[PDB]
Design a protein around this ligand. Structure first.
Ligand SMILES: Nc1nc2c(ncn2[C@@H]2O[C@H](COP(=O)(O)OP(=O)(O)O)[C@@H](O)[C@H]2O)c(=O)[nH]1
Ligand SMILES: [Ca+2]
Length: 172
């Protein structure tokens, strides 16, 4: 009846960027390459965050919602956001602006816990989005930029843990 902190994370970003692959790497320690692109789902896991046992809830969104009101309701439920793009697809980086605005409209707080996540860092030779331009956007938004690979696990725990650290600090 002792209650753990429950950190509600939402994955956002355009299609194919790695939302599900990041989620499933974090949850199950597997790189999953064919996860149904239209499927949204939630995941929960106990994690030890800076020595404190907590629960993380991850909503892996898929952009499928029947109404804007439904999408906004999901976003309103979230406490922090991983805003993912693929470093190999410039258009997915451009699309992060829309997710940022959607989140800000619902959460009404420019300091909402939020990381800009450039995924597919193992595909450096296919990079379309420079580190510099992504860092500059993160600086404009006052968020951290982290590059990840769901394939190699690089920075996967970091993005989820660092987002939980922002939720913990900012929603106190
Ligand atoms: N090389 C590489 N491929 C990735 C990575 N993350 C996702 N993928 C691939 O990109 C595709 C889309 O990933 P997915 O997680 O389903 O994208 P979502 O639509 O954002 O959920 C799949 O074929 C994945 O295997 C990554 O970090 N590196
Ligand atoms: Ca997905």
């Amino acid at each position: 009846q002792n209650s753990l902190a429950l950190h509600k994370v939402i994955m956002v970003g355009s299609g194919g960027v790695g939302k599900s692959a990041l989620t499933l790497q974090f949850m199950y320690d597997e790189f999953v390459e064919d996860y149904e692109p239209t499927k949204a789902d939630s995941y929960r896991k106990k994690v030890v965050l800076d020595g404190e046992e907590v629960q993380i809830d991850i909503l892996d969104t898929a952009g499928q919602e029947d109404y804007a009101a439904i999408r906004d309701n999901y976003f309103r439920s979230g406490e922090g956001f991983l805003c993912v793009f693929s470093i190999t697809e410039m258009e997915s980086f451009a699309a992060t602006a829309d997710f940022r605005e959607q989140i800000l409209r619902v959460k009404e707080d420019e300091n909402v816990p939020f990381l800009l996540v450039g995924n597919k860092s193992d595909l450096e030779d296919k990079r379309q989005v420079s580190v510099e331009e992504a860092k500059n956007r993160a600086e404009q938004w006052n968020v951290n930029y982290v590059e990840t690979s769901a394939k190699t696990r690089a920075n996967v725990d970091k993005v989820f843990f660092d987002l939980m650290r922002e939720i913990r600090a900012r929603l106190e």
